[PDB]
Design an enzyme around this catalytic site. Structure first.
Site, PDB file in Angstrom:
ATOM      1  CE  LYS A 172     -23.071 -19.616  32.533  1.00 15.16           C
ATOM      2  NZ  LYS A 172     -23.485 -18.199  32.750  1.00 15.16           N
ATOM      3  CG  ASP A 195     -30.675 -11.818  33.659  1.00 12.39           C
ATOM      4  OD1 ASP A 195     -31.808 -11.602  34.136  1.00 12.39           O
ATOM      5  OD2 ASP A 195     -30.162 -12.959  33.607  1.00 12.39           O
TER       6      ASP A 195
HETATM    7  C1  LIG Z   1     -21.778 -21.555  47.456  1.00 12.23           C
HETATM    8  O1  LIG Z   1     -21.527 -20.979  46.178  1.00 12.23           O
HETATM    9  C2  LIG Z   1     -22.533 -21.024  45.258  1.00 12.23           C
HETATM   10  C3  LIG Z   1     -23.775 -21.596  45.481  1.00 12.23           C
HETATM   11  C4  LIG Z   1     -24.721 -21.586  44.473  1.00 12.23           C
HETATM   12  C5  LIG Z   1     -24.424 -21.003  43.251  1.00 12.23           C
HETATM   13  O2  LIG Z   1     -25.446 -21.018  42.328  1.00 12.23           O
HETATM   14  C6  LIG Z   1     -25.225 -20.475  40.997  1.00 12.23           C
HETATM   15  C7  LIG Z   1     -26.162 -21.236  40.114  1.00 12.23           C
HETATM   16  C8  LIG Z   1     -25.517 -19.000  41.013  1.00 12.23           C
HETATM   17  C9  LIG Z   1     -23.183 -20.427  43.018  1.00 12.23           C
HETATM   18  C10 LIG Z   1     -22.228 -20.435  44.030  1.00 12.23           C
HETATM   19  N1  LIG Z   1     -20.976 -19.838  43.905  1.00 12.23           N
HETATM   20  C11 LIG Z   1     -20.270 -19.161  42.935  1.00 12.23           C
HETATM   21  C12 LIG Z   1     -18.980 -18.705  43.256  1.00 12.23           C
HETATM   22  N2  LIG Z   1     -18.242 -18.019  42.381  1.00 12.23           N
HETATM   23  C13 LIG Z   1     -18.782 -17.786  41.186  1.00 12.23           C
HETATM   24  C14 LIG Z   1     -20.063 -18.232  40.844  1.00 12.23           C
HETATM   25  C15 LIG Z   1     -20.673 -17.963  39.519  1.00 12.23           C
HETATM   26  C16 LIG Z   1     -21.949 -18.427  39.207  1.00 12.23           C
HETATM   27  C17 LIG Z   1     -22.527 -18.158  37.980  1.00 12.23           C
HETATM   28  C18 LIG Z   1     -21.846 -17.412  37.024  1.00 12.23           C
HETATM   29  C19 LIG Z   1     -22.479 -17.107  35.691  1.00 12.23           C
HETATM   30  O3  LIG Z   1     -23.651 -17.520  35.495  1.00 12.23           O
HETATM   31  O4  LIG Z   1     -21.805 -16.464  34.861  1.00 12.23           O
HETATM   32  C20 LIG Z   1     -20.572 -16.945  37.328  1.00 12.23           C
HETATM   33  C21 LIG Z   1     -19.995 -17.217  38.556  1.00 12.23           C
HETATM   34  N3  LIG Z   1     -20.801 -18.921  41.728  1.00 12.23           N
END
Ligand SMILES: COc1ccc(OC(C)C)cc1Nc1cncc(-c2ccc(C(=O)O)cc2)n1
Length: 331
Positions: free
Chosen positions: A67, A155
């Protein structure tokens, strides 16, 4: 002269009993890893304040999520980081694995465990009555944990719940609005997505607490069982309260504002009006009926209260009959 004070009913003094370093996050020095350990594979999503990518840790070949933060006050970055470190190892809390900086663009980036998240659109159509109960229980584990560790998420909404349906695995993500609960403290009410904002935010009552999260959980539950996303569909923050009033009725609303002596915005005088408290049957149809039960409605009713002091706690929620099937199956 002035609104009436409020304290959390539970976990009131938990941060007070801790070393200062636990909650005094402005004094946290950040431990930076090596940015060259991670190669970005592909972008996964964009946000208000961040872009997320799949990456490879080249030292162990583990898949990871990065991130990258858009610019934000360093205070707010130290808060998210501190909160994530405090909650590490807690049930269904996303694990922060590392923290790096691009050496050139000086932009900070948080590195997280990977979850094989299932299509949210695809998932929230396929969900059985039992699944909703199971995943709701999983979320409550996370909320009781973070509340017991002195933290409000602020949130809670479906986009911030990652579910690997294959492995029946859930993670509560995005701790960027989370805050430490301190009794007496007046918080910013400009938090949370509109459809999930609690009445306390909407009427500008600032001395809120963990119970905020329980309202937003209620909004989630309602949309899942009634297959209506979002459940309270306001056009703005004012109409959001009205959309709530048209369901919980105005009598309890005005008792609430009376109990806490809340100076209600005059704009509200026009739009709020007088509305009865509806029964939940008005949202039950043949398409959603298989998700709705007396237990579900009893539970939902006890999350969705104007008075934050009167809402279920996470622990009380976990003890509700809606979850008996789930608790029996876990042991
Ligand atoms: C196919 O996997 C995805 C497709 C879209 C996606 O969009 C994000 C913007 C939510 C995340 C993912 N996958 C993952 C997988 N493991 C962890 C995370 C994750 C996403 C955000 C955060 C945070 O905002 O602390 C923490 C962890 N995210």
């Amino acid at each position: 002269s002035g609104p009436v004070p409020s304290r959390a009913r539970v976990y009131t003094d938990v941060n007070t009993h801790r070393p200062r370093e636990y909650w005094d996050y402005e004094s946290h020095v950040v431990e930076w890893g090596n940015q060259d350990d991670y190669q970005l594979v592909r972008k996964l999503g964009r946000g208000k304040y961040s872009e997320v990518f799949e990456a490879i840790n080249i030292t162990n070949n583990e898949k990871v999520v990065v991130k990258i933060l858009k610019p934000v006050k360093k205070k707010k970055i130290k808060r998210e980081i501190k909160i994530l470190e405090n909650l590490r190892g807690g049930p269904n809390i996303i694990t922060l694995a590392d923290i790096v900086k691009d050496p050139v663009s000086r932009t900070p980036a948080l590195v997280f465990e990977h979850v094989n998240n299932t299509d949210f659109k695809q998932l929230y159509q396929t969900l059985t009555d039992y699944d909703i109960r199971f995943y709701m229980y999983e979320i409550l584990k996370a909320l009781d944990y973070c509340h017991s560790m002195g933290i409000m998420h602020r949130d809670v909404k479906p986009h911030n719940v990652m579910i690997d349906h294959e492995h029946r695995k859930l993670r509560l993500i995005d701790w960027g609005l989370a805050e430490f609960y301190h009794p007496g403290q007046e918080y910013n009410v400009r938090v949370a997505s509109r459809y999930f904002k609690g009445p306390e935010l909407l009427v500008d009552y600032q001395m809120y607490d963990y119970s905020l999260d329980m309202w937003s959980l209620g909004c989630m539950l309602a949309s899942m069982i009634f297959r209506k996303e979002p459940f309270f569909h306001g056009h703005d923050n004012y109409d959001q309260l009205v959309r709530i009033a048209k369901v919980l009725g105005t009598e309890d609303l005005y008792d609430y504002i009376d109990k806490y002596n809340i100076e209600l915005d005059p704009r509200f005088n026009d739009i709020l009006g007088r509305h009865s408290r509806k029964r939940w049957e008005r949202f039950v149809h043949s398409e959603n009926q298989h998700l709705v039960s007396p237990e579900a409605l009893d539970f939902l009713d006890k999350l969705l209260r104007y008075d934050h002091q009167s809402r279920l706690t996470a622990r009380e929620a976990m003890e509700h009959p809606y979850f008996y099937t789930v608790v029996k199956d876990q042991a």
